[PDB]
Amino acid sequence: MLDAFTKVVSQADTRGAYVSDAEVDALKAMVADANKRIDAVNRITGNASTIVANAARALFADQPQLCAPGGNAYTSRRMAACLRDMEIILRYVTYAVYTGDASVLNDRCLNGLRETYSALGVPGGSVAAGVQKMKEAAIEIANDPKGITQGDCSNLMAEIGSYFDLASSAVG
Amino acid sequence: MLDAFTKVVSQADTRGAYVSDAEVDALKAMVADANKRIDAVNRITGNASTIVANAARALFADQPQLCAPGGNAYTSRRMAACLRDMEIILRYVTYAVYTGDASVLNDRCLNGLRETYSALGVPGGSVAAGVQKMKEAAIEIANDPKGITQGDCSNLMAEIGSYFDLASSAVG
Amino acid sequence: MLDAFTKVVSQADTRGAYVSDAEVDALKAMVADANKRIDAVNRITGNASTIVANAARALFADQPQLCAPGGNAYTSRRMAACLRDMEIILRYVTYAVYTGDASVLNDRCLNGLRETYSALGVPGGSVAAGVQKMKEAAIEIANDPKGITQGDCSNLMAEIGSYFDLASSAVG
Amino acid sequence: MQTPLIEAVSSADSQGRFLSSTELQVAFGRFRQAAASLDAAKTLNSKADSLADGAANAVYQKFPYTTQMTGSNYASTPEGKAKCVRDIGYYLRIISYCLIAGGTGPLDDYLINGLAEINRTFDLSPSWYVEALKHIKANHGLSGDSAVEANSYIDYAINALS
Amino acid sequence: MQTPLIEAVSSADSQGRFLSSTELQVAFGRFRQAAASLDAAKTLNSKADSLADGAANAVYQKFPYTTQMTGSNYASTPEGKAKCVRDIGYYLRIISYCLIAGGTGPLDDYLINGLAEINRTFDLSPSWYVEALKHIKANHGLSGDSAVEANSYIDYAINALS
Amino acid sequence: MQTPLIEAVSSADSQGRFLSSTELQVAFGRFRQAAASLDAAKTLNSKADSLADGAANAVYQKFPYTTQMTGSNYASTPEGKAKCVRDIGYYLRIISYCLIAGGTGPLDDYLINGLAEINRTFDLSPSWYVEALKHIKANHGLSGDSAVEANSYIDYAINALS
């Protein structure tokens, strides 16, 4: 996998170039904001079971046929498998936020997942809707202004969002 | 795998329904005939090597090029592999008769078998003819009226037949 | 795998025939020349690292973009992997020369290799050029007239050449 | 999905062999009980709505907070009560399947496997369903070996919840 | 398929290495015997039909029931005798291949592997083919090291049948 | 490619778990040093051509045969010297990447893994590059913790060559 720093390095090495002054300053800027990054990872990580539970509730309210008999989340084994996938995707998302790069999420979670779901008959469209509900629950938790030093985490929340959206696009 | 009873259950669960009175009576009827079922499994099982040997003889009389040099059952290793496949298919058939459902035979034996044979160059058409010869030998043995309490096993023999025919269609 | 003798046997067995007098005389002729065969295997084997090193030098002189940054042999790990492939192919070639049949080289080395390289992004065309450079270095070494009893190894060198060319065609 | 028949085939198949006289006798055993159990499943079907309400009422008595406390996971609403009676209908329906199949297979595959994960994630108390099962056990109105079987399946479900 | 040459390559390849001086000397050894063995294979070809009948006759003497008892697996018919002489022709032809290849490989791959299964399933007695091989051994009419080799292959086949 | 951040994710992922407070503190540690190391990488870029020539000159002093002996692997030609200074530019550039990444990952993946194989096959002496690195170490012109880091990466490369 790559993190934000080795991502920049690998693109440079491919051109045989040193990292430019501009790219270095871009990474410094990311270093300056890194407490905020680590808060988001901490907050999402520590509220993982709540984000999964609430997203699942909202998905099934929106899509009740998923868990009526004959639905693909009906029966405890399939419901549990569904919740487990939601947790797994949330975990890879927290890894992308921490490293500041999507590659861990792409390489170890999303690549091949669409194909896995179609071979199984899992409705990818509904998985995508579940991921979006986790996005909303997760960003509300990560960007909560209580119990934290006050400041602007706008770009960071957009970044978090883009990792959830990548997961939605990989299966939807 | 499914047996005759869980096959009915799974179709019901998919609709969120109890097994109907009619489906229950259909299974009771199958329970009433179950000694006959178990005789067929016993008789085919206990005459397995005879059914395989005789079917192989009849297949090669009909198709002598299979075992002339350059044929796909020529050489002892290939002949043995061929006899072994015949035995394996007969064994899965006895399992379908015992459970009263094809799923064990489909899931563990027939699925992917056509593809296995084409990758190998085994002539699927001739495997199908071998299975049909086992069907004939097996039904003669299962429906022999000697040494058994007298009665009607017509529907059961048709069922046995349909499992052999499923094996023939999966590779032919 | 087959060697030159079992290759002839397997073609005969397929027809249900004894090896002909002509085919037997062809193998006798190969037996009469076998010291030369074994010299070639010995000489290529004992100069393996020199043949690889020199072929690699000549390939990169001809194709310098392979090892400039962003090239597929740039970085020590990829350069080492490239040299290793060259060695591996040379080793299977020596096995084909020793047995007098391509099957070992086809079965254990070349089959599936084109597909492996495309999935990786390795430029098969350039691998083929590397193999050709090994061919030239190897035949110069195998056919060196110094330190050896004098005679004609023309057909043997053409045979060695055809194994290198098979490797080039399998990936190029 | 485990029934006496499938257990025997799975043993025979894992050892690469044909079925034994013993596995044949397993089938006789299964077939000797089957008809009284099939009958039991039919009577459970005709009393399902009745049993499910009765059971859900018994849960609302024992745990009065479930009718009053607001929030998703409680029966304080028309929708909450309807979710609750639905879940009870599932335990009852899946239990009737065990009578049909001659074993716990339907219970394991449809309800028990993952149950803890479901109850934890959706904040449903296992004790609720234990009470509902207790009510079902005391009102199915079955007799003979049908009752003893039905009750084994109910006990097996209570035990998974505890 | 095992010959001295293929055994050496398979050892070298399983250890990820180039062939050794020793494996080269294996090849010299194989090549030193080859021409007399190739000659032996040619003489077996020119006498094959003769040997096969002679052998099959020797089997019908030793085991007279094979000519008289009716049934698929016996030489009581034109077709039964023709099957029998065919099988003997296979042992002879496959033995000639061992002389060509310098080892038992053709015998293992074409005849010995699965032999017991074939003989059991088709009710053919191994002792029959043992007699036929004994006749071949006493009439091939080979001399020198060719004979010692041919006879090792014949003995190896008799041993697989016993 | 190993950095403090990737090491933490790889530990967490191999154990199937979310990141710990400790792995968060790893990140703080990495981020506390980062800006001075990023600065170090910028100064190495502005002095790269200068350092690379200086280093290559220092190699030609210490090992005079490299300038005079003819053959592919030596700097006796315009092309040989240009190959040499190129290689030195790679060590320098890849070292600057380690300052960017906060660890040896770029050094391991781009240079060290396979290095022995490269040097052996192309008849390049490791001692040459050891001298070049020694020159770089004595002229980068860095101070503070930037120097201590840069020097750790240079030492790590010398150690791989020894």
Ligand SMILES: *[C@@H](C)[C@H]1/C(=C/c2[nH]c(/C=C3N=C(/C=C4\NC(=O)C(CC)=C4C)C(C)=C\3CCC(=O)O)c(CCC(=O)O)c2C)NC(=O)[C@@H]1C
């Ligand atoms: C946007 C995400 C929200 C927000 C973030 C924010 N955080 C800080 C300051 C800090 N954050 C931390 C983080 C942690 N400390 C810990 O002990 C742990 C567990 C290991 C974590 C994750 C730390 C140490 C600081 C500095 C000390 C402090 O608490 O102040 C800021 C201030 C600026 C900065 O980058 O330092 C901001 C803005 N702020 C909001 O209002 C958003 C809702």
Ligand SMILES: *[C@@H](C)[C@H]1/C(=C/c2[nH]c(/C=C3N=C(/C=C4\NC(=O)C(CC)=C4C)C(C)=C\3CCC(=O)O)c(CCC(=O)O)c2C)NC(=O)[C@@H]1C
């Ligand atoms: C159609 C398949 C043939 C046939 C079947 C048939 N069988 C019975 C009765 C029984 N079959 C058994 C079976 C076994 N007993 C054993 O000990 C074993 C080994 C474990 C087996 C497989 C048994 C116990 C009975 C009852 C006792 C008896 O032997 O009579 C019937 C009678 C009706 C019934 O279902 O019970 C029939 C019709 N009958 C034929 O004529 C067909 C050729």
Ligand SMILES: *[C@@H](C)[C@H]1/C(=C/c2[nH]c(/C=C3N=C(/C=C4\NC(=O)C(CC)=C4C)C(C)=C\3CCC(=O)O)c(CCC(=O)O)c2C)NC(=O)[C@@H]1C
């Ligand atoms: C063409 C390849 C070159 C060539 C070959 C050639 N070789 C020989 C003779 C022999 N070669 C060997 C080989 C080895 N002896 C060993 O100890 C080892 C290591 C195990 C090997 C590989 C041997 C024993 C002989 C015979 C003894 C001898 O050294 O003379 C000949 C002569 C004819 C023959 O086939 O025997 C030839 C022609 N000759 C050339 O000029 C080519 C460049």
Ligand SMILES: *[C@H](C)[C@H]1/C(=C/c2[nH]c(/C=C3N=C(/C=C4\NC(=O)C(CC)=C4C)C(C)=C\3CCC(=O)O)c(CCC(=O)O)c2C)NC(=O)[C@@H]1C
């Ligand atoms: C829940 C929102 C949705 C849903 C999910 C569901 N998933 C499965 C089964 C599998 N899901 C995966 C996915 C992963 N495995 C991994 O290791 C990783 C990380 C690399 C992922 C992302 C896999 C491999 C399976 C199959 C194997 C297994 O079950 O462990 C099911 C079960 C399908 C079945 O028919 O059994 C379900 C139900 N279901 C929904 O309806 C939601 C939209």
Ligand SMILES: *[C@H](C)[C@H]1/C(=C/c2[nH]c(/C=C3N=C(/C=C4\NC(=O)C(CC)=C4C)C(C)=C\3CCC(=O)O)c(CCC(=O)O)c2C)NC(=O)[C@@H]1C
């Ligand atoms: C005999 C009627 C026909 C015939 C058969 C034949 N089959 C093979 C080789 C294989 N057959 C199988 C099939 C199975 N393996 C299984 O485990 C199961 C149960 C799930 C089945 C149904 C497989 C996997 C092989 C290959 C691996 C192996 O040999 O064990 C051969 C050998 C082919 C070869 O070229 O070596 C033959 C000859 N041949 C005929 O001509 C008849 C029509």
Ligand SMILES: *[C@H](C)[C@H]1/C(=C/c2[nH]c(/C=C3N=C(/C=C4\NC(=O)C(CC)=C4C)C(C)=C\3CCC(=O)O)c(CCC(=O)O)c2C)NC(=O)[C@@H]1C
């Ligand atoms: C050198 C002339 C060219 C070149 C080669 C190169 N190859 C690889 C990677 C692999 N090559 C193989 C091939 C084999 N593996 C085997 O076991 C065998 C014998 C059966 C062969 C022929 C495989 C499997 C790999 C991948 C796994 C591995 O690395 O061990 C690379 C690395 C590619 C990468 O992106 O990492 C390279 C660079 N490169 C060139 O440019 C030359 C034309």
Ligand SMILES: *[C@H](C)[C@H]1/C(=C/c2[nH]c(/C=C3N=C(/C=C4\NC(=O)C(CC)=C4C)C(C)=C\3CCC(=O)O)c(CCC(=O)O)c2C)NC(=O)[C@@H]1C
């Ligand atoms: C009645 C005893 C109590 C009660 C029930 C209640 N349950 C839910 C929600 C769910 N129940 C399940 C259970 C199953 N799903 C299955 O597939 C199976 C096996 C066939 C079982 C047993 C599941 C998955 C859900 C959630 C998904 C869904 O909505 O269907 C609720 C709603 C929970 C929520 O958070 O919205 C309620 C209210 N409530 C009580 O207070 C009673 C004591």
Ligand SMILES: *[C@H](C)[C@H]1/C(=C/c2[nH]c(/C=C3N=C(/C=C4\NC(=O)C(CC)=C4C)C(C)=C\3CCC(=O)O)c(CCC(=O)O)c2C)NC(=O)[C@@H]1C
């Ligand atoms: C002669 C010594 C005795 C004899 C022979 C006889 N054999 C058969 C049938 C078969 N023999 C084989 C043997 C082989 N198949 C091979 O591929 C190889 C290796 C190349 C061997 C050695 C096989 C497979 C058969 C059956 C298939 C076929 O028909 O070819 C028969 C007919 C058996 C039958 O049941 O129909 C006979 C009569 N019979 C004697 O009595 C002699 C003493």
Ligand SMILES: *[C@H](C)[C@H]1/C(=C/c2[nH]c(/C=C3N=C(/C=C4\NC(=O)C(CC)=C4C)C(C)=C\3CCC(=O)O)c(CCC(=O)O)c2C)NC(=O)[C@@H]1C
């Ligand atoms: C300078 C200190 C000395 C010197 C150098 C010299 N080097 C080469 C050739 C190669 N060097 C490498 C090294 C790398 N490749 C990489 O990808 C990396 C990591 C990014 C490194 C460090 C390689 C692969 C080659 C060969 C391929 C190529 O041509 O690029 C030469 C030419 C060698 C030849 O045999 O032609 C020379 C002359 N020479 C000296 O004498 C100096 C003391």
